[PDB]
Design a protein around this nucleic acid. Structure first.
Lengths: 234, 138
RNA sequence: AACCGGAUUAGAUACCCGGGUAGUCCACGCCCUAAACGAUGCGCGCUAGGUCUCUGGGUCUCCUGGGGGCCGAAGCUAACGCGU
RNA sequence: CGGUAAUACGGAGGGCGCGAGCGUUACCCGGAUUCACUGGGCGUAAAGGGCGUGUAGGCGGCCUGGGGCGUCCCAUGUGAAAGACCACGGCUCAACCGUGGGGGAGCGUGGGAUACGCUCAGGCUAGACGGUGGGAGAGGGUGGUGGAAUUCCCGGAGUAGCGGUGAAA
């Protein structure tokens, strides 16, 4: 069930803010805007999903990254609808790269789940009370989907590679293959498996992402509903 | 007008490949054709073909690269890493058969024009003839 | 410019003030220098784009020439930068 | 390096390097791609001529044919000896020496090739120039004319100052 779904309103997006590297994956410039060829979207989408399968079934790990308004919450869903880690709030420099050291923050996060419910729940010099228990805040805020990552991922799934270029560059440095939902800002050449689509339309992001998580579960049996994600659409 | 049609061609090719174009034109001459077939035969270009663009003869040259490479910067390796004119109209160059250079322990090639015709260096060594050392590739 | 004065100043052949000749303006003939600077010789082909603008043409949200600017692909550079 | 702790001076011990030599000075090549042919450069490092016009000179688009000057190939002649190089040899070795062998650009002669460069003879229109139509412009030369302002002269009116500076004069 694809075909026209994307053609809902999730074809073409950005306008003359382009990157001529994307000249291939475009149909026409109607009414001032760029409109992306969907035949080609599919051509790529298969190969891309086919990648997902082959490493999904092998029991891989995809690191999901979306931070635009229009993604964000739709990432902490489908990622968690998959047990797959995600970055949602802000991409920290060296997440893949300085990983060992960024991890030390998770090493130190879950020292607080301990003292969440412990003899240290309503005691200790109680200015420390809030500050320690408001330190977990920064921690829970940024490392929500990141705590699961215990080893470097086998892939990264991105929704805007020119927004998330800092992550991508980290990937490729580590040869971690880059998967991305990407439109006419983004430089294809450094996106390994490409889903030429729409970095912005909240509909588009979901239509694609959710369905890609579907294969991640289909490759381990037990698919469900249209999935807990239909946004505050209006 | 154009001062070195051949040198211009090598360049057009050089320039196209570094941005990884799939194709280039070069206005057409029979001598240009003869050089092209060497590149072609020796595995540097996918091939050329004649076309007439805006009413006048060009040769469409089809370039040829490597596989998308691994890490940061996935740009392919070039098949033609180094194409270079030797005998320019300023300083014309002629080797005899004894002085024909071997480009890069053989992994290269030197297009070289003789009275037996346009040849690689091994072709010309074998045929036993020298001439205008045209350029070199690898 | 010079020079003649007034100031200021340790002095002040200067900076400030008041005067003032050559000169600056014109004609003709000389002089031929300069940070005569984009400190980048002339011509031609080739090599992403975005944007501002002067001037043509066209089917006139855009396209297509020729100029003037900035940012910037590839590449270049010791760097700063340069980048149709 | 040396100004009271000197591995840098002078000395001694020791050690390093060579050895019937070891140092010194002079000169040549080197390294020096530091005159760059191989093999460099000129925005700010030294380096673009203040700008043009165009003399000689250098360089020259696409197609065909003739000539074969450049270029290339074959043969041949020349390239003395010594030297250099490889072998074998003669002085007990070597230095020295002897015998033999091997190349070689360059130039001459005869023959041959014609892709490129040259030349001659035709072609072509993409470079250049021209035709017709249209455009913007402090591009240049000559005459002419306009308003604002300064200075001076004349008149009216009017009175004790103006000016100038940081302050003054």
């Amino acid at each position: 069930v694809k075909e026209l779904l994307e053609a809902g309103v999730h074809f073409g997006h950005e306008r003359k803010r382009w990157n001529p590297k994307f000249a291939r994956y475009i149909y026409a410039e109607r009414n001032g805007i760029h409109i992306i060829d969907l035949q080609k979207t599919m051509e790529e989408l298969e190969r891309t999903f086919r990648f997902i399968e082959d490493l999904a079934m092998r029991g891989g790990t995809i690191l999901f990254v979306g931070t635009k308004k229009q993604a964000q919450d739709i990432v902490r869903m489908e990622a968690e609808r998959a047990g797959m880690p995600y970055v949602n709030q802000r991409w920290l420099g060296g997440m893949l790269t300085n990983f060992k050291t960024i991890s030390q923050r998770v090493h130190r996060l879950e020292e607080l789940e301990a003292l969440f419910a412990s003899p240290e729940i309503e005691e200790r010099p109680k200015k420390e009370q809030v500050r320690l228990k408001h330190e977990l805040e920064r921690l829970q805020k940024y490392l929500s989907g990141f705590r699961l990552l215990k080893r470097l991922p086998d892939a990264i799934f991105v929704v805007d590679p020119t927004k998330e270029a800092i992550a991508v560059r980290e990937a490729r440095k580590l040869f971690i293959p880059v998967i991305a939902l990407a439109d006419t800002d983004s430089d294809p050449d450094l996106v390994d498996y490409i889903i030429p689509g729409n970095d912005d339309a909240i509909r588009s992001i979901q239509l694609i992402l959710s369905r890609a998580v579907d294969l991640i579960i289909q490759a381990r049996g037990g698919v469900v509903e249209p999935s807990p994600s239909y946004a505050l659409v209006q | 007008m154009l001062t070195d049609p051949i040198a211009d061609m090598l360049t057009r090719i050089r320039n196209a490949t570094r941005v990884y174009k799939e194709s280039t034109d070069v206005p057409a001459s029979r001598f240009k054709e003869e050089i092209l077939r060497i590149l072609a035969r020796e595995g540097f270009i996918k091939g050329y073909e004649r076309v007439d663009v805006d009413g006048k003869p060009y040769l469409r040259v089809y370039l040829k690269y490597g596989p998308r490479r691994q890490g940061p910067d996935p740009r392919p390796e070039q098949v033609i890493h180094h194409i270079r004119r030797i005998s320019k109209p300023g300083r014309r160059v002629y080797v005899g058969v004894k002085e024909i250079p071997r480009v890069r322990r053989g992994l290269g090639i030197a297009i070289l024009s003789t009275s037996k015709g346009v040849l690689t260096d091994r072709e010309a060594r074998k045929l036993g003839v020298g001439g205008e050392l045209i350029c070199e590739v690898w």
